[PDB]
Every structure is written in C-alpha cells, then in structure tokens.
Amino acid sequence: YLAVTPDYVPPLNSHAFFRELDIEVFSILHCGLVTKFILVVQLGPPELLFLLEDLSQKLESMLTRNIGFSHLQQRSAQEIVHCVFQLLTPMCNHLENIHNYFQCLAAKVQEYHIMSSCYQRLLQIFHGLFAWSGFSQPENQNLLYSALHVLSSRLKQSQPLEELLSQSVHYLQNFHQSIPSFQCALYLIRLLMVILEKSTASAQNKEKIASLARQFLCRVWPSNISNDQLHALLCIYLEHTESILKAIEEIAGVGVPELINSPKDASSSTFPTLTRHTFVVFFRVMMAELEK
C-alpha cells in the first residue's frame, strides 16, 4: 500500500511513527533459529531480522533524534549495556547458526538476503557493545571481563585477561570465511580492532588485523561495495600493515598494471576489489596514507 501511496502522513523513518519496543522484548532472542532451506512456534529468519534491526538501532542511539527512543533514554547507558550483556549467549548461538548456514552453502534467493542481513546486524551489535566509551572506566572492567569470558567459552571452558582477548579474537576471526557481504567483513574487522585495542601487546595484533584486511581486499565479493566502505577497509589495511611503503608499491606497481592489461569491465587479479570504478578510492587512500 505504501508503493501506491506517495504522500501520506500516518496519524499520531519508521521509528518516529511506530510504537517503541521495550528493552525486555529482546529477551525472546533465547529462542532458537529455524531456517526452511539448507538445513511449536520457533523464531524465523525474518523475525530475527526484525528484532536485530530494532536492537541495533537502540544501541546506535545511545552507545554511538529523541523521537522513537523516548523510553530508551530514560534508562541509563550502563543498564542498557548490562541488559545486552545477558543477550551475548543467545546472540552467539544465533551467530553460530548463521555461520553454519552460510558454510553449508558451499555445496531461496529472498531468504538469502534476510540471513545475510541478520549476519550484518549481529556484528554491528557486537561491535557497538564492545566499542563503548564506558569500558575505558575502571568500574565496568568486571563487566568487560564477563563479556569476554562468554566469547572465550564458546570454544573451550579466574583466567588472566590476556588469554580472554586471545580466545575471543580467535573465536571471532573464525567467522571470516562465512562472511557473505563486504559490509559484514568491515564490521567483523572493526570488531576485532576494538577488542584487540585493550591488549597492550600490539606487535602481532597489527599483523593479524592487516592479514585479514588484505584477505578481504583480495576476496572476490559476489555482485554492491560502496566506496566509503572500501575506503575504510583500505585505511585499516594500510595503517596496520608492516611496511606501509612496501604495500603501496604492491598495489600501485602490480595491481594497477594488471587492471590496465585487463579489459574495461574487469578487475585486478591480485586485488579483485580494484577495478576502474574503484581506482579513485585506491588512489586517494594511497596518496593520503603516504602523506601521513
């Protein structure tokens, strides 16, 4: 009905018109996820996307105008972060199920996008929770330790903080092969950055960030990639690589000549994300990073 209705003012930007959902609604995320294909009343992909989209919007409002969030602003930021803390266990189960769903696709279309969108929403919520200004304070370090312990225990279960981050990043980095879209990869790589920022040792942390970032750049993403997202990933790869100068030689001295020899509607063999439409992004990042 909205398509055939150009101009219409709903009686009293969906958040400004729909009734706000309470923070206790997301307690039903404990229900398991059931997918019709490639796998009582149980949670489905379209219903999971609805809950995740609302939860991601709520966190983005405060952790990262007042219409549609009036009941949310009454609660404190710490309490909402505390509320999402108990949601880690159901989201990780949802996250793992989406991981397995995409892995089983190695061997319909409409349900594919919803599943990918759910996978995008979870990483945004995961990134938003850990990338909170409150974790810099010492009072919430116990909560941060508790949140990491949930992530670490997903593989094997008073551990020291260092291995808690090491296990959590390793568990999260295991999701890279199942990433279905460029946006999810950027959220995954940015989620690793904020968690690794807590660790004091950054000698090898930059290498795993840069190695994963290069793998995302060299991956043949099915066709969708925006220049702003590509610009963000290129900055991450260049700022974290071992030799920023040597990396610029590889892209400019190897990738660009390959693009020239390739036909007009093609891409570089070493960097499939580098095409004639994305050269401006690659050129702008390399020049700006070289100047820095």
How many residues does this entry show for the chain?
292
Give the containing element (helix H, strand E) for 291: helix 279-291
Residue type, 223: S
Three-class SS of 212-229: HHHHHHHCCCCCCCCHHH
Cα angle, residue 22 at apex, residues 18 and 28 outer, rounded to 5°: 110
- Both tokens of 82, joined, read 């505390």
Answer whether 204's CB lies under 8 Å from 130's CB. Answer: no
- 249 to each of 189, 213, 245, 262, 286, how far by Cα in Å? 24, 17, 7, 19, 10
Give the containing element (helix H, strand E) for 263: none
Answer whether 45's CB lies under 8 Å from 118's CB. Answer: yes
Residues 6+ apart with CB under 8 A from 266: 259, 275
- 244 to each of 192, 237, 287, 289, how far by Cα in Å? 20, 9, 11, 8
Three-class SS of 121-183: HHHHHHHHHHCCHHHHCCCCHHHHHHHHHHHHCCCCCCCCHHHHHHHHHHHHHCCHHHCCCHH
Q: How many distinct helices (H) and strands (E) make up the chain? A: 13, 0
- CB-side exposure of 79: number of CA atoms within 13 Å? 7
User: How many angstroms separate the CA atoms of 273 and 256, rounded?
Assistant: 12
- Both tokens of 122, joined, read 């979870």
Neighbours of 31 (CB within 10 A): 18
User: How many angstroms separate the CA atoms of 185 and 189, rounded?
Assistant: 6
DSSP state of 25: G
Residue type, 238: L
- Both tokens of 20, joined, read 């706000």
User: How many angstroms separate the CA atoms of 236 and 214, rounded?
Assistant: 9
- Both tokens of 167, joined, read 């296990």
- Both tokens of 36, joined, read 């019709």
- Both tokens of 276, joined, read 């004639």
- 200 to each of 55, 92, 161, 166, 195, how far by Cα in Å? 31, 26, 11, 12, 11
Residues 6+ apart with CB under 8 A from 177: 103
DSSP calls for 62-116 = HT---TT-HHHHHS-HHHHHHHHHTTHHHHHHHHHHHHHHHHTT---HHHHHHHH
- Both tokens of 100, joined, read 């397995």
Give the torsion sign (CA, 102, 105, 111, 112).
Answer: positive
User: How many angstroms separate the CA atoms of 129 and 118, rounded?
Assistant: 17
Nearest of 128, 215, 150, 127 to residue 179 by alpha carbon? 215
Give the torsion sign (CA, 172, 174, 179, 183).
Answer: positive
User: How many angstroms separate the CA atoms of 118 and 112, rounded?
Assistant: 10
User: How many angstroms separate the CA atoms of 172 and 127, rounded?
Assistant: 11
